[PDB]
């Protein structure tokens, strides 16, 4: 039975920014927070998705009612990042792999709600609100709201202007108090705080993670897929940006900070007896200090992350080791 | 039983431009043409609406299946020219006054179909097509398609970009072969010819009237309302631009050309015996020649139009002389 103060700590730890602290505290004084996270069903999710999933885990630990939105219409509206025929296959792939990630990090699925955008975003009342919103949002504001999220092409399409407006309306139709996403969503979040009240709807609390550098190319591609075999995880980890003593733009350290510490509350560095043997850290700042002092070597850091990451991936790889899930993976991502 | 050639003449006479003559003739060789005309339910219709209604009459004379669309959602999308609360009152006013105009010029209403946009434009299949269209139409093309139709404001709204796309989709959902409107619709019509095939839908024939100068200020406001009393019709007609011998930008002559000649097939100029007495014209070009020669005086032309216009308005004014229609007129246009 966590106190409102303990819930607030669980909910907001590791975030880059909280908008709406006043209302957030008002809610936690009385009841559970209702929050959602959305993802457009576009490319294959990679290990970076453990970063938002670790905050989802925190939200459930705090007692929140959590909704996960598979934003299939949004994937279509974002420059057809998922063509319309493949959408429902993409939703199935996303649902299976996101549930597998949550099961792997021990998140109880029975208190989560999963919904796909097209379950309600084609309804008459929602569509009427899209038109009501379109009558107050300028073309200027919808273009700028999506600048960091929607793909920016030479001749922008009308769909790209619709995208942020629907993401705002989703807060009302999912009946939430708050929306969580990475800080790349910030301009959509502030757009929603401005325009939802123009429709008679309350502004929501917005919770924003930092954009965490990947476990590969410095801060694009070459990422680690959730279904990569151990040997491919090992190979990709060797090439990760991880300079000795350099605690910035370090995707290996960032994964520890945002995924492994919240999961386990500790992190063990594997190290030879010659250099002091293993050491258990209870706080990220202590590990960071040792890495800056160069008494945690990059190779030992990578070794330690490799062991923990393969533990997270093992049940996922097992789950997708089914004839039906192998066919789904290939069918959702053909050529 | 008019021939295909006689139907084509009735359908296309007095038009400024026909797009799709090849397909138009292919259809008339086999069956009746399916056509619609739409109007956004915004301001009170004035006597200029007799110009499109006279072409509707021609279409029915040619045997066409005609739909009249009361585009209520479009009125809302066009800079809220009709706010959402007043829309259904505006639709009722438009339906009553348009049916009255057609009855006045002797158009049989029983073979016309009347539909309001929100009967189908909020449906799931239509909304899906709006999103499919938005994924191919650029912001650039939708802005330019509506440049002469949608109000151009300093900070354009998203609704204004949606407007031409929905007008294009209306051609498919109303299941027509052709759309009729004034030539101010041309950029929406060519937009529809370009983009409907991107959705797997056929291009439509487009029929365009000329933009006829009003019976008032030269070629805005001061117009004659369909419910104006005889005395107000008389007063407004006195101030109409009608210079002797000047057959251009002459709203009085244009009304004769586009409304009175199609209705009656003749036009009688009322003139004193001293100047030759009355004369009946069987063709507009003969009247124009006499006006250019200054043997039809502006006052006599206005007198002759006044008599005919009050005949067209009399049954409309009688129809709206009901307690329920008086309340409707005031409720749809308050303050
Ligand atoms: N490296 C990282 N570090 C920290 N957070 C990260 C990443 C990362 O990298 C990536 F490559 F995986 N993504 N995320 C976060 O997870 C989510 C990704 O999902 S998304 O598909 O991008 N969704 C969108 O864009 C949203 N508009 C979709 C949407 C649509 C309608 C709604 O009503 C609500 C939402 C967003 O919150 C992202 O910030
Ligand atoms: N002086 C004149 N001479 C000759 N024709 C004239 C005029 C005139 O003057 C005015 F003041 F009355 N209007 N018209 C013509 O009648 C119609 C008016 O209706 S409207 O409300 O303007 N409709 C729109 O704009 C259309 N986008 C509405 C629409 C929406 C969805 C659809 O699927 C189809 C259509 C249009 O065709 C106009 O050209």
Residue numbers in the entry:
A (entry chain A), B (entry chain A): 4 to 222, 228 to 343
Question: What do the authors report?
Answer:
Like E1 enzymes, aminoacyl tRNA synthetases (aaRSs) are adenylate-forming enzymes (AFEs). They catalyze the transformation of amino acids into AMP conjugates, and then into aminoacyl-tRNAs, to supply protein synthesis. PfYRS is a Class I aaRS, characterized by a catalytic domain that adopts a Rossmann fold (residues 18–260) linked to a C-terminal domain (residues 261–370) that is involved in recognition of the anticodon stem of tRNATyr. PfYRS contains the two motifs characteristic of the catalytic domain of Class I (sub-class c) tRNA synthetases: “HIGH” and “KMSKS” (70HIAQ73 and 247KMSKS251 in PfYRS).
X-ray crystallographic studies of plasmodium and human YRSs reveal differential flexibility of a loop over the catalytic site that underpins differential susceptibility to reaction-hijacking by ML901. Importantly, recombinant HsYRS was not stabilized in the presence of ML901 plus substrates, suggesting the inhibitory species is not produced by, or does not bind to, the human enzyme (red curves). Similarly, ML901 inhibits tRNATyr acylation to tyrosine in vitro by PfYRS, but not by HsYRS. We were not able to generate a structure of HsYRS in complex with enzyme-generated ML901-Tyr as HsYRS does not catalyze formation of the conjugate. S15F), the 222KMSSS226 loops were not defined in the electron density (Fig. 5Cii; fig. That is, the decreased susceptibility of HsYRS and PfYRSS234C to reaction hijacking by ML901 is associated with mobility of the KMSSS/KMSKS loop, which is, in turn, associated with rotation of the His49/70 side chain. These conformational changes may promote dissociation of the charged tRNA, thereby preventing the hijacking reaction.
